[PDB]
Symmetry: D2
Subunit: 123 residues, 4 copies
Amino acid sequence: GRDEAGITGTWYNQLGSTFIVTAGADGALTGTYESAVGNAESRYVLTGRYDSAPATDGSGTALGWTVAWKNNYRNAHSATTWSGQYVGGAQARINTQWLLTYGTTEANAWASTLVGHDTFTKV
Amino acid sequence: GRDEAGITGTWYNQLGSTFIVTAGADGALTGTYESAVGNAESRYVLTGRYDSAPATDGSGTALGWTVAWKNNYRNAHSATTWSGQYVGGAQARINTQWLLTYGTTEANAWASTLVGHDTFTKV
Amino acid sequence: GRDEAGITGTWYNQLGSTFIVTAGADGALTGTYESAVGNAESRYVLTGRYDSAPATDGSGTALGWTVAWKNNYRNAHSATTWSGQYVGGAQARINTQWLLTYGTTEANAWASTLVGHDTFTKV
Amino acid sequence: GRDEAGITGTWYNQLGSTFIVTAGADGALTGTYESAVGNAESRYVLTGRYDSAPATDGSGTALGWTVAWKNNYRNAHSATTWSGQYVGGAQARINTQWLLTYGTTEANAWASTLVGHDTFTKV
Ligand SMILES: O=C(O)CCCC[C@@H]1SC[C@@H]2NC(=O)N[C@@H]21
Ligand SMILES: O=C(O)CCCC[C@@H]1SC[C@@H]2NC(=O)N[C@@H]21
Ligand SMILES: O=C(O)CCCC[C@@H]1SC[C@@H]2NC(=O)N[C@@H]21
Ligand SMILES: O=C(O)CCCC[C@@H]1SC[C@@H]2NC(=O)N[C@@H]21
């Protein structure tokens, strides 16, 4: 993929969380996520996808991934999805918006979903 | 997983799109998506995660998945993430909210991301 | 406004909440909201804006409004914004997506904002 | 209102847009918005609401507002809502997430709504 090398590695967001990803040639993303906040401890599995043949006109590279917040330590009964774009160069970034959905009863489902935004850097 | 059997299979949303997923015991989701709308044709790879040990108190099952909108036919230079919950029973549903991010230039990045909501049924 | 008459009146969403609005010629929206759910009781002030000269090509009419969830009875320390479009005709609707922000400490601000979607009808 | 004085005035976001607001004692927000981006020129009317009696525990102040993107110069057939919180102190900020809805045909309504985030400062 054009940015396979650029995306693969360890990223950090403004909260202090750590995103560890491998980009495959075909568009896969696999890795681990460790949140600095919330009902979370240690690493969680992630998977996702990215555009392995982006535009050559200076546009970013679209991608996304999911974490279900269950591991051997905790289960928050929740999942987050991040949707965003990789922007390459000396100050590389992944700019995302995310959706965190809790399992709820039907009566509470109106209040099931948090929205926010994370920016990941290599430093 | 508690809902491995409930989630695995073919789902359809209010647009007429078709979501084909396999749920693994461990929390994986793998499959294909075919959109009835947008800059899309035929099937695209998806991956995601779900809570394989949900609450037993009538709450839904949190899950999410991604599609990068590249296949052998088209490349929209975009990715969607769906975040939601599976609700089991005679009228099973997956209720989601989604985020569709386009690769953009930095000048247009304010306008990179669409938000919406899809409800999937087995019929 | 083109839809001043169509928008003005009493609307109900899928939760059972009641939206009472007056549309002004100039684009204003003023009224009251009464939620069927959440940390809310009785009516709350709303204000917002709508496109008073929409496209004539069958497109909906863009609009939005806010409620801060303080009245004489309760204060949730929160505000919701609905962003959407009015679609006229025998089955008129307002289709919206909303953002509910809580006041939080800086440590909890990542979790400050809920997202959802409401559809309002005249019946 | 507790933050009537703190909110009232001229704010600027990371795009260079200019938000000019007056906060009323009762919870009103009135003013003008001028966007540095998009299908916009000059000032547009805004209205909204804020929590005029916030928590005293260091939490921010919830608020929101709307702009319909029609004025004497242009009509984008769209509306944005910002939902967020005011945080007072030497570095005051308004942190928001927003929803920009376009009027669309029913066939294109899935793609009607952009989501993003703006941070406003006094400098
Ligand atoms: O509390 C939970 O339900 C599980 C932890 C969620 C942490 C969220 S995911 C979005 C944001 N970005 C992070 O790095 N952490 C929070
Ligand atoms: O146009 C694109 O960029 C690729 C197709 C996007 C189709 C979207 S994904 C969200 C919504 N749900 C669907 O089933 N289709 C649309
Ligand atoms: O709980 C709160 O903070 C105040 C009540 C919020 C009720 C929300 S606003 C979005 C959704 N639509 C409704 O009609 N009610 C809920
Ligand atoms: O293009 C349009 O439909 C009207 C202009 C929209 C400008 C948006 S509103 C959200 C973001 N914040 C800004 O200051 N400008 C853009």
